Amino acid sequence: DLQRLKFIRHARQLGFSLESIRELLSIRIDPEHHTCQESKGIVQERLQEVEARIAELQSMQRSLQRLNDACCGTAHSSVYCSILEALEQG
Amino acid sequence: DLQRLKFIRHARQLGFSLESIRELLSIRIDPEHHTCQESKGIVQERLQEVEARIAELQSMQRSLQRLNDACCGTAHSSVYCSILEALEQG
Ligand SMILES: [Zn+2]
Ligand SMILES: [Zn+2]
Ligand SMILES: [Zn+2]
Ligand SMILES: [Zn+2]
């Protein structure tokens, strides 16, 4: 029951890079020589990384939604498929 | 100017796996023997993959937002930092 393992798992579940986690463990073991500025910087970095991803994934999701909704999804010959036509224009 | 290269790039920008792209190129080269059901299935699979990711990334973003907002981010000794306390409870 080494408590820092739970700490690490939680940082992991938040998608912190191994390098960021090393920094956090460094702060955790010696708090008297680190500040809120350092720990917050690590969080802001990870937060910006996540928000940028979510944005580029939602862009894809919107395009994928249009592609999905326009196709009939039946035995209709793919010779007429809008999905292939769309991927052609991009 | 081999047009299928543009096709591939567009599928790439949508985050389709290499295997899905192989399937699309197979449909593209021989449309007379494939249907909208096949091409749509490939799109739905990718769409569900993206929506699940966006959901797990937004979960992180919400937690990261709370962590970020609660910390003063100044020289305040990390001995009092809420970020480390939070990562402790998870
Ligand atoms: Zn159709
Ligand atoms: Zn179709
Ligand atoms: Zn503080
Ligand atoms: Zn703090």
From Swiss-Prot, chains A, B:
Gene Ontology annotations of biological process type: DNA-templated transcription; positive regulation of DNA-templated transcription
Signal sequence residues: none
A Gene Ontology molecular function term of the record: zinc ion binding
Residues holding Zn(2+): C71, C72, H76, C81
Alphabetized UniProt keyword annotations: DNA-binding, Metal-binding, Transcription, Transcription regulation, Zinc
Top-level division of the source organism's lineage: Bacteria
Quaternary state and interactors: Homodimer.
Function: Zinc-responsive transcriptional regulator of zntA.
Protein name: HTH-type transcriptional regulator ZntR
Part of the intact protein present: 44 to 133 of 141
